[PDB]
Amino acid sequence: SDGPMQRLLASLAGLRQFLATAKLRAAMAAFLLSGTAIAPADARDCWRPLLEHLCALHRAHGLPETALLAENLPGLLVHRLVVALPEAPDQAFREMEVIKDTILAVTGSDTSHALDSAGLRTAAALGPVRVRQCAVEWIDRWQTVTKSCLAMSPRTSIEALGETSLKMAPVPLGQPSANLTTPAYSLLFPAPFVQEGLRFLALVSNRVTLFSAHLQRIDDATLTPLTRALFTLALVDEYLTTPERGAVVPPPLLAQFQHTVREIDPAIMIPPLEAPGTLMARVRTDVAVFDPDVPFLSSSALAVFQPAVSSLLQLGEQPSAGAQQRLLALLQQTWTLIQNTNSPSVVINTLIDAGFTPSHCTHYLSALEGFLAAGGLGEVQQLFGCIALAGSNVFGLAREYGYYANYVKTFRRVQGASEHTHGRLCEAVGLSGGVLSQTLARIMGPAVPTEHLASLRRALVGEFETAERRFSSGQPSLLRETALIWIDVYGQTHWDITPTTP
């Protein structure tokens, strides 16, 4: 078992028994940009002797570089401590807890005694007390928020409770992870344990977000009982049904569905909430709900009723002029809003409010594409094409929307493959020459972390200034480049920063 920390530990022990200058110093330079990263076990076994040898070997020679690496080795270690989180919550909180104990091991009082023993400083920006404070706050708050979202989530798993329904207030996609990116945490942003925690919390949070919106249009009174029951069927199909258990329905929701569905005109037929195939398919009718004289569908949420619409767009149907005027109002409002908005929360809310639940967007895509195969579209069909392309891609990026480094990669894959998926529709409607990648880019674009890397750079410059200043009056430490290259190379490697320095 060799590892970077292990390699420099063994290298540094032999130095203790200006050749030691070149060897020692090139060794530090080699540790700061070793390709691999430290596993928790390695840090836990090797933290003590490496720190002892570094503090005493520091004491004998008194170079600024030993002083700095000793003063800020905790943070430089958590910068390189690998994190792998499992899908299951138990395994995830467990796995995070082992790292909490790893940093507690790094930031022990023994390190403060061995730094103060060597005349060093324990209050360094990446020093033990600071790294301890920031990591502890971030991880504790991380559990509290992640479990909070995990409780008000659709719980269809084998894991036994009853899913909350009326409980939920609409949460934006970014609000849970928002406190965890404040500039206060800039010092630890490149750490894998922030990024991994943020993808986990993003995955739970976004699901809770969609579930919140769709619940909101469940419990609305202005909507017609037909529209109400339709949102109910969609909710059940997409968030409360698994291949493993047929239907997972709370008794209050099922009773509410019963009383609301008995109000519907028997001209339109609705299946009861009970366990294959989705329920939304089971709905059958012959009435043209789109006609304005007809009062059955709320003109607000008119695309919620997937069978009649999918028939409209597969069969290229020609609605009554009043019905069509009823459509182009909603479709054209929705698409004007989507076209001219940069808030993902707003576009989510307006897609769900219009009845454009993700699976619907899918069926709609399928319906048009199949139309263009057999056949140049009406404005109804073209606008459904717009909202369904942009809707499918916004809903795809929505699950993983976060401020972590991987959303750049996923976002690149998705906007790259946005237009080419269902190319006939996309070119026929106009999103062809990069326009859809432009829209998805403006609304779902990944956040830019230049400020966090700048701030951390300034802090590392400061620890360089003090650390050299005490140990070398003039300040010509050769290791500056070696420290800054990690910053630029992280920036362009994970975040694709250009990069640039002041």
Residue 65: CB atoms within 10 Å? 24
Could you tell me which stretch among 49-57, 58-66, 297-305, 493-501 binds Na ion (CB under 5 A)?
493-501
Our CB check for Na ion shows the closer of 471 and 490 to be: 490
- CB closer to Na ion out of 353 and 488: 488
CB of 339 to Na ion, least distance (A): 35
* Binding segment toward Na ion, per CB under 5 A, in 28-36, 223-231, 296-304, 494-502: 494-502
Which of 41/461 has CB closer to Na ion? 461
118-119-124-126 Cα dihedral, nearest 10 degrees: 0
Instruction: Report CA torsion sign: 464, 466, 468, 471.
Output: negative
Q: Of 193-201, 289-297, 315-323, 484-492, which part binds Na ion (CB under 5 A)?
A: 484-492
Rounded to an integer, what distance in angstroms lies between the CA atom of residue 167 and that of residue 260?
20
Of 288 and 487, nearer to Na ion (C-beta) is: 487
Alpha carbon 236 to chain centroid, angstroms: 24
CB of 72 to Na ion, least distance (A): 18
Chain centroid, CA 339 distance in Å: 23
Decide: 95 and 120 in contact? Cβ < 8 Å. no
CB of 134 to Na ion, least distance (A): 21
DSSP 285: E
Q: Which of residues 272-291 bind Na ion (CB under 5 A)?
A: none
Per CB under 5 A, does 319 bind Na ion?
no
Interface mask toward Na ion for 428-467; x: CB under 5 A: ----------------------------------------
Q: How far is the CB of 461 from Na ion (least distance, A)?
A: 11
Among the residue ranges 10-18, 128-136, 277-285, 481-489, the one whose residues contact Na ion (CB under 5 A):
481-489
- CA nearest 8: which of 199, 100, 87, 26? 26
Which distant-in-sequence residues (6+ apart) come within 8 Å of 45 by Cβ? none
Do 102 and 43 touch, CB atoms closer than 8 A?
yes
Minimum distance between the CB of residue 447 and Na ion, rounded to whole angstroms?
Answer: 17
Q: Pick the stretch among 245-253, 295-303, 336-344, 479-487 that binds Na ion (CB under 5 A).
A: 479-487
For helices 40-61 and 109-117, what crossing angle results, to 10°? 20
The CA distances from residue 236 to 163, 239, 242, 275, 309, in Å, are 12, 6, 10, 11, 20
The residue assigned the tokens 């989180």 is: 85
Shortest gap between Cβ of 126 and Na ion (angstroms)?
17
In the complex, least distance from residue 331 CB atom to Na ion, rounded to whole angstroms: 46
In 263-302, alpha helices (H): 279-282
CA distance 26 to 412: 38
Per 3-state DSSP, what percentage of the chain is helix, strand, and coil (rounded to 5)? Answer: 65, 0, 35
Which residue in 274, 242, 92, 94 sits closest to 157, CA to CA?
A: 242
Residue with tokens 């219009």: 354
- Minimal distance, residue 48 CB to Na ion, in Å: 33
Compute the C-alpha angle 255/259/264, nearest 5°. Answer: 140
Identify residues 368-427 at the interface with Na ion (CB under 5 A).
Answer: none
Numbers of helices and strands, H then E, in the chain: 23, 2
Looking at 12-20, 62-70, 229-237, 482-490, which segment touches Na ion (CB under 5 A)? 482-490
Q: How far is the CB of 378 from Na ion (least distance, A)?
A: 52
Nearer residue to Na ion within complex by CB, 95 or 488: 488
Q: Per rule CB under 5 A, is residue 480 in the interface with Na ion?
A: no
The secondary structure of 317-336 as a DSSP string is ----HHHHHHHHHHHHHHHH
Contact region for Na ion (CB under 5 A) — 132-140, 253-261, 417-425, 480-488? Answer: 480-488
Binding window for Na ion (CB under 5 A); candidates: 224-232, 364-372, 388-396, 485-493: 485-493
Instruction: Take residue 190 and report the two structure tokens written for it.
Output: 């490149």
Nearer to Na ion, 291 or 488 (CB): 488
# binding residues, Na ion (CB under 5 A): 3
Whichever of 400 and 488 has its CB closer to Na ion, that residue is 488
Smaller CB distance to Na ion: residue 337 or 487? 487
Nearer to Na ion, 128 or 446 (CB): 446
| Cβ closest to Na ion, residue 40 vs residue 499 | 499
Q: Is 499 in the site for Na ion (CB under 5 A)?
A: yes
| 225 vs 499 by CB, closer to Na ion | 499
Residue 286: DSSP 8-state: -
User: In this complex, which beta carbon is closest to Na ion, that of residue 30 or of residue 487?
Assistant: 487
- Applying CB under 5 A, the residues found at the interface with Na ion are 487-488, 499
